[PDB]
Design a protein around this ligand. Sequence first.
Ligand SMILES: O=C(NCc1cccnc1)c1cc(C(=O)NCc2cccnc2)ncn1
Ligand SMILES: O=C(NCc1cccnc1)c1cc(C(=O)NCc2cccnc2)ncn1
Ligand SMILES: [Ca+2]
Ligand SMILES: [Ca+2]
Ligand SMILES: [Ca+2]
Ligand SMILES: [Ca+2]
Ligand SMILES: [Zn+2]
Ligand SMILES: [Zn+2]
Ligand SMILES: [Zn+2]
Ligand SMILES: [Zn+2]
Lengths: 169, 166
Amino acid sequence: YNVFPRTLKWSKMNLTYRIVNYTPDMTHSEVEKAFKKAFKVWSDVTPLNFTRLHDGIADIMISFGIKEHGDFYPFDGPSGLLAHAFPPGPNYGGDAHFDDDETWTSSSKGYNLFLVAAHEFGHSLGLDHSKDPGALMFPIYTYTGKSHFMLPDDDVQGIQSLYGPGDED
Amino acid sequence: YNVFPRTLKWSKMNLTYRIVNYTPDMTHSEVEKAFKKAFKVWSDVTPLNFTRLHDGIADIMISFGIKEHGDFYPFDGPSGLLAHAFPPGPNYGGDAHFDDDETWTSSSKGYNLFLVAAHEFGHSLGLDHSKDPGALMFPIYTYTGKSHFMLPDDDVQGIQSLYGPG
Ligand SMILES: O=C(NCc1cccnc1)c1cc(C(=O)NCc2cccnc2)ncn1
Ligand SMILES: O=C(NCc1cccnc1)c1cc(C(=O)NCc2cccnc2)ncn1
Ligand SMILES: [Ca+2]
Ligand SMILES: [Ca+2]
Ligand SMILES: [Ca+2]
Ligand SMILES: [Ca+2]
Ligand SMILES: [Zn+2]
Ligand SMILES: [Zn+2]
Ligand SMILES: [Zn+2]
Ligand SMILES: [Zn+2]
């Protein structure tokens, strides 16, 4: 027999993702680069592996949409809500949605896609919000301006409490 | 940091359920008896008690629906998905939905409602699928044709590991 796990998390280390569509704001290459880097933020500190699928059903379906887009969390036009992701689970579990009424960038203008994505994927993996103002999972977008990204310890401890550290070096 | 909390089991031994609507394939009486029998499967081997409510919100809301029915976990027409239930918790947690594009029965043709319900209620209580081919919680529907239902030991051990014996 089997009882449901104690925490909401993926029961497999090999996960797949699919970029269903693209925002008008960035080139396909820019968007792909941003998401790949965001997944690496988490794979670098756990035993998780992320493989991209170009079609079909992936564990983490990524898409850009506006207003009502297929769930109980419609977006609200420019400003306000910017994106959200569902926690680990069947069907839409793990999926990540980005509000395409926002401005997405690979720089410091508007919302940095990589940064927001890293945050959303945290939710896709089982992390909720943190009270640490400097955490990636803090609820409010707080771009620091630094050039090098380094996952805050609060986030490291959180994700490892779910999946372990993987190779520590 | 924070993770998403998982209610491993109901924090109370007395649970409520409500049959919201009925399938066209069986009489109201047959449906009611099938669900009552399904709950008895689990209460017979644990301290759990189930009481039926005829209105309002119950811990376990039971309903029949087709395709997209309100939770974005759409059914797929005849065959395939038969039903699904949410693990313990508030709101949808514990609720059980049955695909009404399937043919349900108790003593005629179709999938045995009691059997599927017993399986789904197992999920409502905190049980995942079992690897034992003959267990109630095995993922594949396998009707044996016997007139008497006996909960397999695997399921007994599983549910009791959460709630203990009756
Ligand atoms: O703001 C943050 N977290 C909260 C949040 C994040 C997303 C969506 N909602 C709420 C946040 C920002 C940064 C940061 O600026 N790092 C420098 C950086 C950024 C991009 C590329 N290279 C270096 N670090 C850690 N947490
Ligand atoms: O098939 C089974 N389990 C897997 C399953 C069950 C539901 C949904 N998905 C997967 C299963 C079937 C039976 C059985 O036939 N017992 C006789 C019986 C049936 C009805 C009324 N009285 C006596 N026993 C134990 N496990
Ligand atoms: Ca918005
Ligand atoms: Ca998914
Ligand atoms: Ca409920
Ligand atoms: Ca079906
Ligand atoms: Zn959405
Ligand atoms: Zn968030
Ligand atoms: Zn449903
Ligand atoms: Zn099942």
